[PDB]
Amino acid sequence: EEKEILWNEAKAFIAACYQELGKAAEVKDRLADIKSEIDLTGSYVHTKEELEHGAKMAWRNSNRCIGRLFWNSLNVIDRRDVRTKEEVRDALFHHIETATNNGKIRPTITIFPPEEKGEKQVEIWNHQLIRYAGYESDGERIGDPASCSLTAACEELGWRGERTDFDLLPLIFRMKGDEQPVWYELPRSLVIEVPITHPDIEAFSDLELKWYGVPIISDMKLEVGGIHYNAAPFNGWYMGTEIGARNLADEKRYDKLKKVASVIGIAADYNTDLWKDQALVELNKAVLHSYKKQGVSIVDHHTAASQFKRFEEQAEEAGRKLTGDWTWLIPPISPAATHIFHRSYDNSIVKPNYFYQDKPYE
Amino acid sequence: EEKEILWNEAKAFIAACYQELGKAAEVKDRLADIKSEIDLTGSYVHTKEELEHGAKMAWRNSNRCIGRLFWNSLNVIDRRDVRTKEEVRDALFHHIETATNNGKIRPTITIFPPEEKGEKQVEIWNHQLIRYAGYESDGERIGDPASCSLTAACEELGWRGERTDFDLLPLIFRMKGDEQPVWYELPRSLVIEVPITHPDIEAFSDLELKWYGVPIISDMKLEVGGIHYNAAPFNGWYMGTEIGARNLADEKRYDKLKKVASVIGIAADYNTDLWKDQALVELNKAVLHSYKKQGVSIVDHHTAASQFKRFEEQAEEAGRKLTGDWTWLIPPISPAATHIFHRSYDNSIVKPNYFYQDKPYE
Ligand code: HEM
Ligand code: HEM
Ligand SMILES: N=C(Nc1cccc(OC[C@@H](O)c2cccc(NC(=N)c3cccs3)c2)c1)c1cccs1
Ligand SMILES: N=C(Nc1cccc(OC[C@@H](O)c2cccc(NC(=N)c3cccs3)c2)c1)c1cccs1
Ligand SMILES: [Cl-]
Ligand SMILES: [Cl-]
């Protein structure tokens, strides 16, 4: 069955991919090659064209992603050649550098060797390549609570955080054959961060908030034509609400709404005053203002929804079915001010796509 | 099959209802009575206890309703005795009066005779008993665009609106046997309205906004034990976001966000300024402030979500499965500031319940 699963997925992907690339005539011969290759080796190897277009299709098929208008401009870096942890580390360093691009963020994915027999060649432990540590002990809460389990795992391996609210976690990954992952501290020169200030409320800087420029998701599996690329970190730029309405706002994250209320000069005492809503607006204004002022790419939710509308239109014009997850596509503030809220979406799963996979720790 | 559908639904409802009422012992005999009655007449008649509890269960089962904590305190008015249009009209007038209760709103439902052979005895045309007219002609848009089709239908029947932005539509309903519905102007003394002012922005009154106190949904079918009560208007009080984030905010409703932005002194030019979000917060603050100041019941979305959390807990403690529609339960502003956003809900349909039915016009 496993071989057959591979072959069925391969057939489907190659036909669709080559059709999109105007390579329909080459489908028959390529399929035979793949079929022979699966018979002889138990798998097959993507051409660079297949890999690149596969990663793009996967983004295009990501139901939960509002940023899909730009799917075809994804920068795909083929690192199926890596064999050593130094090569992996350097590839991750490089991804950070080239994706960051001095603040003009380039949507980028680096693709490492795929699983062989369900056996990972490279196993990335980070949730994002750049993320803050979190600590919890004896009433004391420091940093990002979402990172507590990974932080504890790193500290088991000899890493030690300074215990600021914004410690950069090291890169941490394991190679096939090794019992333990290795870790490497991030060079600060590679990591752009943005201090959060408000366009007209001077006291906002008293909160000493900041966030990192580039979100680089590194724990999802890219599946293309039955091949499982468990290690394939990708990035875009942020939508502002991710930072201002979730990372800094959530009670189980940085939980800053009461402090925001205080610095903007409103009471945080009565639900009917809508102080949380007001704090959310000002914090989100501050986030967009700060990224723009520094020259780090970001998009607001209104602009992002407008871009997504064009993606919907483009899909229709191309004769492609549109899939989406309404519950993730609506922004977490003012959702009914976007067109997304007022329509429905088919949440069917189409491949290629990006998938969750079990954590290697905890 | 139709008889059998009735009998199956009856069996299920009576067992559950009587179990909840501690009347489990009386189930067997009541079922026989009903069974005989269905054989002889093609239907059956609810006891007042069954009717009252049925309407309450229906609210309790309404997946989309955040206000369900208070399901058991619904005031059920049995008007299965009405036979004339004057009796219907007076019953609707009465519902308005008693539900309004000088502003201390009482959740209330008035139940009219049920469908006989799918044949309605009373057919209500209004979407809500109290709602504003809408007009569209030659570039000119007046009032509530959502009411345009019903307004046009009323004007076919000899009613004429003053064409303010807030004309009260007449009650309009049809009796079995009549080709045309009848209409009756609402006595203004029965209709409480609230002018919208802001707690600290004096200019907000320049917008001359207002809304009606009591939303009374009159176009849904109450289904209890296989009986179809197509005419059974019900009300609660408003959650503030319904008025401030939808009725007054939606581009296809009153579309007031640009005007709100102007009176609160912010530019409405750049998406990144989040002026729509800011306008939404101030408009929603104004709505809550105004209803509270006048002494008309209303609930904010934070308080409503907290009440819904208790409903969830109460359901668990009672051994009842919880059903809900996440997409309607989240409020349309700051949804991620509520617990609802961060969990999932089973959207299964349980009866008794309230259902959509086709409009008798358009
Ligand atoms: C270019 C800018 C991009 C923006 C602004 C953007 C925006 C977003 C946002 C806001 C989410 C939802 C996260 C949340 O609500 O918590 C999301 C989800 C997602 N995006 Fe994008 N995205 C972009 C690019 C990309 C790229 C380049 C990829 C992959 C090649 C991608 C794949 C995804 C996936 C897989 C998810 C869902 C994650 C999950 O299910 O947990 N996006 N995107
Ligand atoms: C007591 C105060 C109540 C509040 C604050 C409340 C709140 C709400 C809200 C906010 C909605 C969603 C509307 C929207 O988002 O557009 C809703 C839906 C609903 N409520 Fe309640 N509700 C209350 C009482 C009731 C009562 C008394 C009933 C019936 C006996 C009821 C039945 C429903 C139904 C059927 C819906 C769904 C309508 C649809 O699917 O179109 N609610 N409620
Ligand atoms: N947003 C939700 N859940 C949620 C909860 C906790 C964390 C979380 O992180 C998304 C984070 O892992 C993530 C994943 C994918 C993309 C992003 N954001 C980005 N801009 C990009 C990262 C990489 C490419 S684009 C961020 C998402 C919900 C919607 C409805 C109910 S709950
Ligand atoms: N809220 C949504 N849709 C929507 C669109 C237009 C009108 C509308 O009116 C609800 C209105 O008919 C209605 C129905 C039932 C209850 C209420 N509000 C109330 N407080 C009550 C009326 C009667 C008892 S409680 C109001 C709802 C959506 C959620 C997610 C995607 S779209
Ligand atoms: Cl994030
Ligand atoms: Cl309404």
How many Cβ atoms are within 10 Å of A139's Cβ, its own excluded? 5
Q: How far apart are CA B269 and CA A241, in angstroms?
A: 19
Q: Which residues of B touch A (CB under 8 A)?
A: 245-246, 249-250, 257, 271-274, 276-278, 280-281, 284-285, 288-289, 292, 300, 302-303, 306, 326-327, 330, 332-337, 341
Q: How far apart are CA A163 and CA B65, in angstroms?
A: 44
Task: Nearest by CB to B326, from A288, A289, A327: name it.
Answer: A327
Q: How far apart are CA B214 and CA B296, in angstroms?
A: 9
Strands A108-111 and A75-78: parallel
**Chain A residue numbers touching B289 (CB-CB < 8 A):** 272
Q: What are phi and psi of B263, to 5 degrees?
A: -70, -25
Q: How far apart are CA B180 and CA B167, in angstroms?
A: 22
Strands B216-217 and B221-224: unpaired
Q: What are phi and psi of B29, to 5 degrees?
A: -70, -40
Query: Which of A29, A31, A56, A59 is closest to A44 using CA atoms?
Result: A31
Q: How far apart are CA B270 and CA B251, in angstroms?
A: 17
> At A306, is the secondary structure helix, strand, or coil?
helix
* Cβ-Cβ contacts under 8 Å for B188 (sequence gap 6 or more): B168
Are the CB atoms for B329 and B308 separated by under 8 Å? yes
Q: How far apart are CA B14 and CA B26, in angstroms?
A: 10
The residue whose CA has the least distance to atom 9 of ligand 2 is: B65
Q: Which domains does chain B have, with CATH numbers?
A: 1-80+107-117+221-235+305-329 (3.90.340.10), 81-106+121-192+356-360 (3.90.440.10), 193-215+238-303 (3.90.1230.10)
Task: Nearest by CB to B271, from A245, A281, A300: name it.
Answer: A300
The residue assigned the tokens 């039915």 is: B357
Nearest atom, ligand 1, residue A70 CA: 1
User: A274 and B336: CB-CB below 8 Å?
Assistant: no
Q: How far apart are CA A291 and CA B237, in angstroms?
A: 42
How many Cβ atoms are within 10 Å of B169's Cβ, its own excluded? 27
Pocket test for ligand 1, best of A51, A64, A128, A356 (most atoms within 8 A of CB): A64
B146: Cα within 13 Å, side-chain hemisphere: 16
Nearest atom, ligand 1, residue A107 CA: 27
In the sheet with B216-217, reading across from the earlier edge strand, the strands are B75-78, B108-111, B234-235, B216-217
Ligand 4 in reach of B234 Cβ (< 6 A): yes
Structure solved via: X-ray
Q: How far apart are CA A172 and CA B202, in angstroms?
A: 57
Annotated catalytic residue: which of A37, A193, A242, A312? A242
Query: Measuring CA to CA, how many Å separate A300 from each of A290, A292, B99, B331?
Result: 12, 11, 43, 20
Task: Nearest by CB to A274, from B274, B300, B332: name it.
Answer: B300
Are the CB atoms for B117 and B42 separated by under 8 Å? yes
Are the CB atoms for A317 and A311 separated by under 8 Å? no
Query: Measuring CA to CA, how many Å separate A353 from each of A222, A235, A349, A357?
Result: 6, 15, 8, 13
Q: How far apart are CA A308 and CA A339, in angstroms?
A: 9
In the sheet with B353-355, reading across from the earlier edge strand, the strands are B227-229, B221-224, B353-355
In chain A, helix, strand, coil percent, each to 5?
45, 15, 40
Q: How far apart are CA B114 and CA B54, in angstroms?
A: 14
Residue type at position B45 = V
The alpha carbon of residue B124 is apart from the nearest alpha carbon of chain A, in Å, by 27
Query: CA-nearest residue of chain B to A278?
Result: B281
Catalytic status, residue A50: no
Tell me the two tokens of residue B267: 């530019």
* Cβ-Cβ contacts under 8 Å for A237 (sequence gap 6 or more): A105, A107, A214, A215, A296, A297, A298, A299
Note the ligand closest to the C-alpha atom of A248: 5
Are the CB atoms for B76 and B255 separated by under 8 Å? no
Q: How far apart are CA A221 and CA A234, in angstroms?
A: 10
Q: Which helix (H) or strand (E) holds A282?
A: helix A275-294
User: A274 and B337: CB-CB below 8 Å?
Assistant: no
Q: What residue numbers of B does the annotated binding site for heme cover? A: 65
Query: Which of B154, B201, B200, B146 is closest to B173 using CA atoms?
Result: B154
Q: How far apart are CA B126 and CA B360, in angstroms?
A: 10
Catalytic status, residue B68: yes
Are the CB atoms for B142 and B135 separated by under 8 Å? yes
Catalytic status, residue B242: yes
Nearest atom, ligand 2, residue B235 CA: 27
Declared resolution, Å? 1.5
Dihedral sign, Cα of residue B169, residue B173, residue B178, residue B180: positive
Q: How far apart are CA B171 and CA B184, in angstroms?
A: 5
Q: What are phi and psi of A209, to 5 degrees?
A: -85, 150
Note the ligand closest to the C-alpha atom of A235: 3
User: A333 and B278: CB-CB below 8 Å?
Assistant: no
Ligand 4 in reach of A70 Cβ (< 6 A): no
Note the ligand closest to the C-alpha atom of B335: 3
Q: What are phi and psi of B43, to 5 degrees?
A: -160, -175
C-alpha A361 – ligand 4 centre gap (Å): 45
> At A10, is the secondary structure helix, strand, or coil?
helix
Q: How far apart are CA A295 and CA A332, in angstroms?
A: 24
Q: Which helix (H) or strand (E) holds A12?
A: helix A2-20
Q: How far apart are CA A95 and CA A173, in angstroms?
A: 15
Q: How far apart are CA B311 and CA A68, in angstroms?
A: 38
Q: How far apart are CA B12 and CA B299, in angstroms?
A: 35
User: A333 and B336: CB-CB below 8 Å?
Assistant: yes
Annotated catalytic residue: which of B242, B253, B326, B328? B242
> At A55, is the secondary structure helix, strand, or coil?
helix
SS3 track for chain B: CHHHHHHHHHHHHHHHHHHHCCCHHHHHHHHHHHHHHHHHHCCCCCCHHHHHHHHHHHHHCCCCCCCHHHHHHCEEEECCCCCCHHHHHHHHHHHHHHHHHHHCCCCEEEECCCCCCCCCCEEECCCECCCECEEEECCEEEECHHHHHHHHHHHHCCCCCCCCCCCECCEEEEECCCCCCEEECCCHHHCCEEECCCCCCHHHHHHCCEEECCCEECCCEEEECCEEECCCCEECCEEHHHHHHHHCCCCCCCCCHHHHHHHCCCCCCCHHHCHHHHHHHHHHHHHHHHHHHHCCCEECHHHHHHHHHHHHHHHHHHCCCCCCCHHHHCCCCCHHHCHHHHCCCCCCCCCCEEECCCCCCC
Q: What residue numbers of B does the annotated binding site cover? A: 65
Task: Nearest by CB to B336, from A289, A332, A337: name it.
Answer: A332
**Chain A residue numbers touching B335 (CB-CB < 8 A):** 330, 332, 335
Query: Which of A7, A120, A4, A107 is closest to A58 using CA atoms?
Result: A107
Query: Which of B315, B323, B319 is closest to B349 using CA atoms?
Result: B323
Task: Nearest by CB to A271, from B271, B278, B300: name it.
Answer: B300
Strands A353-355 and B122-124: unpaired
Tell me the two tokens of residue A249: 């706002």
The alpha carbon of residue A335 is apart from the nearest alpha carbon of chain B, in Å, by 6
C-alpha B59 – ligand 2 centre gap (Å): 8
> At A219, is the secondary structure helix, strand, or coil?
coil
Catalytic status, residue A163: no
User: A302 and B249: CB-CB below 8 Å?
Assistant: no
Please give the DSSP secondary-structure letter assigned to residue A243.
I
C-alpha A273 – ligand 2 centre gap (Å): 23
C-alpha B289 – ligand 3 centre gap (Å): 35
* CB environment A288-298: b (16+ within 10 A), e (fewer): bbbbbeeebbb
Candidates B66, B306, B333: best to mutate against A (most CBs of A within 10 A) is B333
Query: Which of A307, A319, A361 is closest to A172 using CA atoms?
Result: A361
Annotated catalytic residue: which of A17, A65, A148, A154? A65
Nearest atom, ligand 3, residue A67 CA: 25
Tell me the two tokens of residue B297: 């019941």
Q: How far apart are CA B160 and CA B327, in angstroms?
A: 38
Query: Which of A255, A260, A217 is closest to A238 using CA atoms?
Result: A217
Long-range contacts of A255-260 (CB under 8 A, 24+ apart): A256/A207, A256/A209, A256/A283, A257/A283, A257/B337, A259/A207, A260/A204, A260/A207
Query: Which of A142, A113, A103 is closest to A51 using CA atoms?
Result: A113
Q: How far apart are CA B284 and CA B290, in angstroms?
A: 10
Q: How far apart are CA B301 and CA A298, in angstroms?
A: 29
Burial class (CB in 10 A: 0-12, 13-18, 19+), B279: buried
Are the CB atoms for B309 and B300 separated by under 8 Å? no
Tell me the two tokens of residue A82: 């890596």
C-alpha A149 – ligand 2 centre gap (Å): 41
